[PDB]
């Protein structure tokens, strides 16, 4: 509903009808989630007559519960996303390969008191030592043989530099598929 705080980072369609997406670019990640890879995607609810009744802006990285044109009922949630974070998504499949990710110099491990799980977090300029000031932490994507994977149709090996405070979701050597979130960038409080 709208009584919840979650309604802020999700789209619970109001009436029954069909979903109409425009300027949408998507990809299925290894979690079987349909991920929005465009920055200008808008989601509309179309009634039985082809008329628009609802219109929403969908953020980059949001997961779509259903593809374009799918039918839906009122109250149903069709899109979900992290509102306090910004995702860095890989465009290609392969394996994650750390470069310039050094503990105490460019990254540090932060544990969640409650769940005991942990994440590597990139240190911002300040938090960085002198020796690590000039390094540029990044996630390079390589294949099974350890060779580079090029960004679709170029000579640009896929490498994703990480900004300070970014929270790493996939660590060294982990297998990934296009669409997977490599890291999440926290907001300024």
UniProtKB/Swiss-Prot annotation:
Acetylated on several lysine residues in the presence of glucose. This is DNA-directed RNA polymerase subunit beta'. The modification N6-acetyllysine is found at residue 44. Disulfide bonds: none annotated. DNA-dependent RNA polymerase (RNAP) catalyzes the transcription of DNA into RNA using the four ribonucleoside triphosphates as substrates. The gene is rpoC. The RNAP catalytic core consists of 2 alpha, 1 beta, 1 beta' and 1 omega subunit. When a sigma factor is associated with the core the holoenzyme is formed, which can initiate transcription. The rRNA transcription and antitermination complex (rrnTAC) consists of RNAP, NusA, NusB, NusE (rpsJ), NusG, SubB, ribosomal protein S4, DNA and precursor rRNA; S4 is more flexible than other subunits. Co-administration of salinamide and rifampicin or salinamide and myxopyronin suppresses the emergence of resistance to both antibiotics. The chain holds residues 944 to 1128 of 1407 of the full protein. Belongs to the RNA polymerase beta' chain family. It comes from the Bacteria.
């Amino acid at each position: 509903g709208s009584h919840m705080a979650a309604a802020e980072s999700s789209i619970q369609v109001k009436n029954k009808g069909s979903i109409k997406l425009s300027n949408v670019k998507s990809v299925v990640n290894s979690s079987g989630k349909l991920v929005i890879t465009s920055r200008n995607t808008e989601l509309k609810l179309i009634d039985e007559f082809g008329r628009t009744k609802e219109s929403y802006k969908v953020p980059y990285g949001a997961v779509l519960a259903k593809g374009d044109g799918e039918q839906v009922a009122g109250g149903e949630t069709v899109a979900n996303w992290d509102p306090h974070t910004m995702p860095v998504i890989t465009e290609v499949s392969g394996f994650v390969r750390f470069t310039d990710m050094i503990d105490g110099q460019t990254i540090t491990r932060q544990t969640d008191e409650l769940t005991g799980l942990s994440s590597l977090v990139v240190l911002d300029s300040a938090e960085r030592t002198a020796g690590g000031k000039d390094l540029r932490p990044a996630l390079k994507i390589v294949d099974a043989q350890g060779n580079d994977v090029l960004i679709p149709g170029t000579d640009m090996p896929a490498q994703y530099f990480l900004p300070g405070k970014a929270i790493v979701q996939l660590e060294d050597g982990v297998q990934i598929s296009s669409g997977d979130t490599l890291a999440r960038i926290p907001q300024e409080s």
